[PDB]
Amino acid sequence: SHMAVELNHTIVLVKDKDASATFMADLLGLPKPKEMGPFAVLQLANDVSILFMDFRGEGDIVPGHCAFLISDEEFDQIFGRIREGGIEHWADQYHEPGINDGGRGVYFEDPSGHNMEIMTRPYGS
Amino acid sequence: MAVELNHTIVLVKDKDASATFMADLLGLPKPKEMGPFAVLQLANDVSILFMDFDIVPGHCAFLISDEEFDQIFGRIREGGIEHWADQYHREPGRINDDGGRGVYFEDPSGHNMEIMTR
């Protein structure tokens, strides 16, 4: 025992759990999502997973988002794709359109309309 | 492989009742208010950002030690907090046992939670 409390996983309701999970895994460079029960499961590096679940309702309102921390080099590579592919993006969590500046950030939506953010935290930030 | 989830926003009816309850259930400080959020920081480089304005089997799950599980579950039971062994809230009154223990419950905003040891 004696560990400190961790966030281990959270369920995110989206219009299409498979479109959402595939988009997120492919954009962030993660392996193919796993199917578990009603969920499409995406594991992140800091001992936490996102479990996408089908939900036809509204789903996520700004300034809600899930934010992913990546290196400056991965930020440049993902943002370059988030530009050639016509992904809408915003500099702020309230969505402005067309990045944030210690660190950088950019916000965008997945195919289900789930709000995302990629952000950096370089040394000296 | 290296990407981390740094923070996630959780929509609740009242961000302050939810965050304050969770921090005192989990032995965390008094939450910090940042922008429109009530912030709960966890140990694994991630925070939950509660925001004003939960459908089963959705939940937020926390991995904790066996000793903190015993203490939180004791609080739940002595405090009369409804709890279930399953994410569908179909098995009230019990915990579950994958080499670990787990139990599901709701916070005062009706948000679904889970604590687990494995």
Added chain:
Amino acid sequence: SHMAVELNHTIVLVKDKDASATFMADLLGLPKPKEMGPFAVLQLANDVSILFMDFRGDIVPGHCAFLISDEEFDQIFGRIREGGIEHWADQYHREPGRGGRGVYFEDPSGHNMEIMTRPY
């Protein structure tokens, strides 16, 4: 393939690798270090390990820095301050005594460390 380059481990030369590794593991709440070859191994959460190696022979502002919740920070710094462990607010050890937080200190081998927070 296609992963991005990661720092997987680094070897740190100290007077006593076992005193250093056990001190570090017990202070940061990590499991007991493992012995591998000539090294005492401490694994951290972000897929990187420190391998301590015995060396008769760290200078400021050099250090190894560990990121923790503020809050385990309060718990570890509580140990540092109540236990009389010398500490400084700066990497040059010119400010003894003591957004995010940080504090610098030495392990029993004289290896320079830092614990730091990065809250939302």
Added chain:
Amino acid sequence: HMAVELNHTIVLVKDKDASATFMADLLGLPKPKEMGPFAVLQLANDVSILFMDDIVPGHCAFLISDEEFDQIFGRIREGGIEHWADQYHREPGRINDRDGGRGVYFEDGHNMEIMTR
């Protein structure tokens, strides 16, 4: 268990700029940033190496893809960079196949390792 992360570590070298520039270009990383007394090389797993102005078997080791190993090893071999299969630099001109992966050690005189696991 464990949640503590290694966020940065300072590496002592004769010339911080030669080391950081060499490593970033060899590993396919962007240009290093200079901050205070350090030359900063950021890696993907929420950690940075801070070079500041090394004895075998000490080294710094990088986990990389199979494809990046081929490109770095190609640079090493076509570029004449001395390399060894072992951390003691006793097996020159060889790579290791540890754990089904591939690995090689080399000097920049600071000791490095790349591995694919």
